């Protein structure tokens, strides 16, 4: 049970799974998730994922609460930091 | 009435008690709680403890709301910062 971020549409390409927490760009990069590269994600039922356009949970924020095969053009390849809640 | 963090399993070893607040690594170190050393903890009923893998409330976050004699292998010896709420 985790959030999995995918590099291409429809859960294709490289993928990394994360547990709840508040992840800066530095931490994403260590977890092998590159800057501005997230296109789809799987979110466990009851969890919340707050994707931020800029580092340290700033800039525009997109919220996902279910599996999302396509984040849309505005949010695509924009993730630089992310907060994940098991709520 | 406080949260007490223990260095070994089943509330054994060195222990430090803290009141609600948001504690960075620096502050934990001053309170005599070393980095990456927490294995069990006591949480007062109604309180919440958010344990963070990295400093300044970032990285993976584990949540405890009751006495926990064993934090588990993934969370063991990982506390670098912590938020404690009397709620
Ligand atoms: Ca991509
Ligand atoms: Ca970005
Ligand atoms: Ca320990
Ligand atoms: Ca740590």
Q: DSSP states of chain A as a string?
A: --EEEEEEGGGEEEEEEE-SEEE-HHHHHHTT--TT---EEE--TT-EEEEEEETTTEEEEEEE-S-BS---TTTTT--SEEEEE--
Q: B1-87: which CATH number, 3.40.50.300, 3.30.70.3270, 2.60.20.10, 3.40.190.10? A: 2.60.20.10
- Cα angle for residues B79, B20, A44 (degrees, 5° grid): 55
Closest-approach residue (CA) in chain A for B82: A21
Q: Which residues of A21-49 are buried (b: 16+ CB within 10 A; e: fewer)?
A: bbbbbebbeeeebeeebbbbbbbbeebbb
The half-sphere exposure of B37 on its side-chain side, counting CA atoms within 13 A, is 15
> DSSP class of residue B11?
G
Domains in chain A: boundaries: 1-87
> DSSP class of residue B8?
E
Residue position matching structure tokens 């607040």: B21
- B38: helix, coil or strand? coil
CB contact under 8 A, B59 and A18: no
Residue in B67, B73, B84 with CA at minimum distance from that of residue B33: B84
Closest-CA distance of chain A to residue B31, Å: 24
- B76: helix, coil or strand? coil
Q: d(Cα A34, Cα A25) in Å, to the nearest integer?
A: 8
């Amino acid at each position: 049970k985790a959030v999995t971020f995918y590099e291409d549409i429809n859960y294709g390409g490289a993928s990394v799974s994360l547990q709840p927490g508040n992840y800066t760009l530095s931490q994403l990069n260590t977890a092998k998730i590159p800057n501005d590269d997230m296109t789809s994600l799987k979110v466990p039922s009851g969890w919340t994922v707050d994707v931020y356009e800029n580092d340290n949970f700033t800039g525009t924020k997109w919220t996902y609460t279910s599996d999302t095969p396509w984040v849309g053009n505005d949010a695509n390849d924009k993730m630089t930091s992310v907060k994940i809640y098991s709520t």
